[PDB]
Amino acid sequence: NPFQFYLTRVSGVKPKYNSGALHIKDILSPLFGTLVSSAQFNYCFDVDWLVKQYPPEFRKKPILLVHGDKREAKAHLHAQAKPYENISLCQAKLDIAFGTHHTKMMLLLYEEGLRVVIHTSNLIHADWHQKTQGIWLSPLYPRIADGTHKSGESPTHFKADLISYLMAYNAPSLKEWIDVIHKHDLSETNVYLIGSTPGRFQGSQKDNWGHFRLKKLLKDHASSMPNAESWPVVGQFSSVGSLGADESKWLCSEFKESMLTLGKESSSVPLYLIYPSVENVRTSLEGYPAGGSLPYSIQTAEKQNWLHSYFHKWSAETSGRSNAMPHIKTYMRPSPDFSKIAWFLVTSANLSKAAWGALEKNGTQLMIRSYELGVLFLPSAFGLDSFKVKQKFFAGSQEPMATFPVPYDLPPELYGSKDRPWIWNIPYVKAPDTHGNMWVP
Ligand SMILES: O=P(O)(O)c1ccc(Nc2c(-c3ccccc3)nc3ccccn23)cc1
């Protein structure tokens, strides 16, 4: 397949639903390359667990942890890392309040080349155990020969765009990785990078990041079709920020407007949001503890009850993962009958202004609080007008280079009248979960 989009392994499901899924130990195995060094961009790290995921023969190779922790949290991460002299740390600057470093990415330097992994899992055991998570695996990028002058650039501009993303950190450890990337040929890359970095972007930088980056790519590299107003937008996420007192403040104004863009010419578009209900969490493989990875607070939720009328249950029979709670985030543009999609994005970005950006200064400036990263699959980058949707995620299609593996069921199913969104800081004591327990925060 050309897409190289994988789910993580889920413990406990039938083997047929893990055939072609990847565990972290698979990604780091010597079969993927002879490791020289690596960078692990993430939010949360269990360092002892992380080192054990590397092959024994690679556990002393240099590792850079790129994180956003401050104050006592930074001290704790440093203390986790101090027993391993091969581990260095980069604290990503977060100079706007309430910002986070959420990007999940591995840079893997090998004797044979370079690989980039952009994915959705924290580097802790629980995120790779029984959750639905997404992975994009780059090709093995070969080194450009000493003395050869070539760009190594792809038609999607991925190499320069990944360097631009890393440049935003202004970090010496990441300039070293920028120089590694310069020395490699990334021209086979068929996805577009969509990043968020903290800042206030105007003018020539407005389109670099967040939802304006998405808009710009959709304007330049997608085509509008007849009855485009009938093609829904689907967003699927594991956390919800404060979106405002009604849908016009952000969600259905600037955010939906960027996501419905197609092509360069100048809304009734249905918007489906997929987010686990309480019942989804209760009956999940993990039970109520899965809700510790579904941060949606009651203080935020009670200020935006209008939002929950957009909410659809998690369902993933197609991948055997209805009970594997989602920590993947995805956004896509299906056709009215959900048989095709115009594009697909897998990203770290949840449904929040901090992640996607909020317009300021009379619509002239996009303000972003966090670091995020995802990859966009556009049909034009594969020589296609649209992607067919794969009927069964792990099955064998007649045209695998069309046929995009959407990991959950379409159409999404609206919450029922008795469903409620998972809210992680109130108790649930009416019905026990799959392990016999209640939820008492
Ligand atoms: O639907 P199928 O293809 O007929 C089918 C496939 C597998 C099984 N049994 C089964 C399971 C399992 C069964 C239920 C739920 C979770 C895991 N795990 C293993 C591992 C090795 C061998 C068998 N295993 C039964 C029927």
Numbering used by the authors: 162 to 427, 433 to 607
Lines from the paper:
Human tyrosyl-DNA phosphodiesterase 1 (TDP1) is a 608 amino acid DNA repair enzyme that processes 3′-DNA end-blocking lesions by hydrolyzing the 3′-phosphate esters. TDP1 is of importance because it can reverse stalled type I topoisomerase (TOP1)-DNA cleavage complexes (TOP1cc′s) by cleaving the phosphodiester bond between the TOP1 Y723 residue and the 3′-phosphate of its DNA substrate (Pommier, 2006; 2009). When acting on TOP1cc′s, the target phosphate ester bond nestles in a well-formed pocket that contains the signature “His-Lys-Asn” (HKN) catalytic residues. As we report herein, we have designed phosphonic acid-containing variants of our previously reported carboxylic acid-containing imidazopyrazine and imidazopyridine inhibitors and we have obtained crystal structures of the catalytic domain of TDP1 (148–608) complexed with a subset of these inhibitors.
In our current work, we obtained X-ray diffraction data from crystals soaked with compounds 3b and 4c at 1.56 Å and 1.58 Å resolution, respectively. In the 1.56 Å data set collected from the TDP1 crystal soaked with 3b, electron density for the arylphosphonic acid headgroup was observed in the active site of both monomers of TDP1 in the asymmetric unit. However, there was no clear electron density observed for the rest of the molecule (imidazopyridine) indicating that this region is disordered likely due to the presence of a rotatable bond between the amino linker and the imidazopyridine moiety. Analysis of the binding mode of the arylphosphonic headgroup demonstrates that each of the oxygen atoms of the phosphonic acid is engaged in binding interactions with the signature HKN catalytic motifs of TDP1. The 01 oxygen atom hydrogen bonds directly to the side chain nitrogen atoms of the K265 and H263 (2.8 Å). The 04 oxygen atom is hydrogen bonded to the side chain nitrogen atom of K495 (3.0 Å) and is engaged in a water-mediated hydrogen bonding network with water 842 (2.8 Å) and the backbone carbonyl oxygen of S514 (2.6 Å). The 03 oxygen atom is hydrogen bonded to the side chain nitrogen atoms of the N283 (2.8 Å) and H493 (2.6 Å). Stabilizing hydrophobic interactions occur between the side chains of Y204 and P461 with the aryl moiety of 3b. When compared to the binding mode of 2b, the phosphonic acid headgroup of 3b superimposes closely with the carboxylate group of 2b (shift of 0.8 Å in distance) and the aryl moieties align closely with a slight rotation of the aryl moiety in 3b. Interactions of the vanadate phosphate mimetic and DNA 3′-phosphate group correspond closely to what we observed with the phosphonic acid in 3b.
